Amino acid sequence: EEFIFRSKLPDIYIPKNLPLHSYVLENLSNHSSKPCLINGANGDVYTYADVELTARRVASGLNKIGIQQGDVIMLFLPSSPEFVLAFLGASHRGAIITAANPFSTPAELAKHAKASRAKLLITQACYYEKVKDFARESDVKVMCVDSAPDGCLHFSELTQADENEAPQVDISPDDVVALPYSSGTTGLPKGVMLTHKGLITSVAQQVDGDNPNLYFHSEDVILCVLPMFHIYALNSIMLCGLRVGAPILIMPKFEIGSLLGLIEKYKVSIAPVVPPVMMSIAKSPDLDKHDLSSLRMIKSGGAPLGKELEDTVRAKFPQARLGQGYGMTEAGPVLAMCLAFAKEPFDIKPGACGTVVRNAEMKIVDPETGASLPRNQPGEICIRGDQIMKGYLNDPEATSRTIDKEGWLHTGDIGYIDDDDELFIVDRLKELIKYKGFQVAPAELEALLIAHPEISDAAVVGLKDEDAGEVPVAFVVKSEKSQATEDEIKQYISKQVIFYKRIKRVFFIEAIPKAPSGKILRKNLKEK
Ligand SMILES: Nc1ncnc2c1ncn2[C@@H]1O[C@H](COP(=O)(O)O)[C@@H](O)[C@H]1O
């Protein structure tokens, strides 16, 4: 704690005795009849007044079917109005929301539902069969938003419930409200506990204050094509958008053609994106078949854009201001944010990662010594503030090695801050693999591979890739006499995992390089 970095923006007032829903919808009356949630795929619309009232009904409904304060509700849905209504609804009830990609496999879903100890599952009928077995066998209530196969509940039982019967709840600021899963700096997916105070803090750091880090014009329309089941989109787009009363145009499924049409149609002006989608948008031959002049800002994150794409986007969307931010689930998840988006913008440099958010502290430590480093000195990025997670669910050791004794969250990312307080990420210490912006845990794939009868050891590492950034490859030690082939192993994994967790190549070896403790020498592997 010698060299401590902060935002170039002054600290602001942040409520510390308010529940998340009360905070994000605090200034509802100024725009109560204004559009809040718009479903770009079917035109559904919910005004601000509609969301506030329905949230309370969802709370009454949840109670009615037995969901109590502290209970975990699992969402198995695509980005949508229903997702937000279920979330805000759970927040009003004092319940917790955990979410998973609807494209997950039954095994992945059951594991998630089991670990999170979800009492209720909300999804769509086209995904019902993937939870059908697990459901009955675990006495977990299943609910669908469209049809209601078998005996599962319908979502109108929550949205149409009597608000007057919404239970009386005393939400404490330190009560958990969001439970996203993340592998963190090492190992298997773990439950990240995010509190009311934590999230309110994070939203405030991004959009509150006389000179907000992210400024909104009254005519702005923010796009939500990023997945709501990932906290980054639910926070930076939905919660932040609601907080400032902006209309949010949601896209359940990404399709270049429709998106461009939607941008002209609804006058989309703020486009939150990740490198992969931005790259798809940039390669579109139909950019001139649509009026995209309403676009004034391309907000990127999740992974680096790269100098080339950065230049490409800047060239193909001269009407918009391009900027990049940086987040990590356990951090709330926003750590740094592009100050070129502030009401009174600051200059930013190419490749920049943004500036550490206000009402927070950031330092850079020598991964070895642990000493704090000064400007322009690469090291591990650490952040501290009320916005970071409370810890991992039922996993004290994990928490203890991610958040140190002085409250600093260790990201496992290597970067440095320059004289202009702009953060630059240059390397990654943790084993985390990111394919298409999605997180892929080597330990998870490794466990699946090793469970195979003909495999005695395995290691999964990231292989640099143009289209996805990193593709997972696997080094495998076959058991004696095994004649299993690469394709046979790859299909073995593919059947059990969601699309982005497929291993692209299998390299057979006689032994996985390991340190005395058993830690895989991953750089030793990558070095190959
Ligand atoms: N702008 C960025 N540049 C480079 N890496 C990033 C960026 N944003 C996120 N990441 C990486 O993604 C991790 C966050 O993953 P997650 O917890 O799945 O959102 C960070 O710890 C980084 O390793």
UniProtKB/TrEMBL annotation:
One GO MF term attached to the UniProt entry: ATP binding
Catalytic activity as recorded in UniProt: (E)-4-coumarate + ATP + H(+) = (E)-4-coumaroyl-AMP + diphosphate; (E)-4-coumarate + ATP + CoA = (E)-4-coumaroyl-CoA + AMP + diphosphate; (E)-4-coumaroyl-AMP + CoA = (E)-4-coumaroyl-CoA + AMP + H(+)
One Gene Ontology biological process: phenylpropanoid metabolic process
Residues in AMP-binding enzyme C-terminal domain copies: 444-519
Family matches, as Pfam families: AMP-binding, AMP-binding_C
UniProt xrefs under PANTHER family: 4-COUMARATE--COA LIGASE 2, LONG-CHAIN-FATTY-ACID--COA LIGASE
Similarity section: Belongs to the ATP-dependent AMP-binding enzyme family.
Record-given protein name: 4-coumarate--CoA ligase
Natural source organism: Populus tomentosa
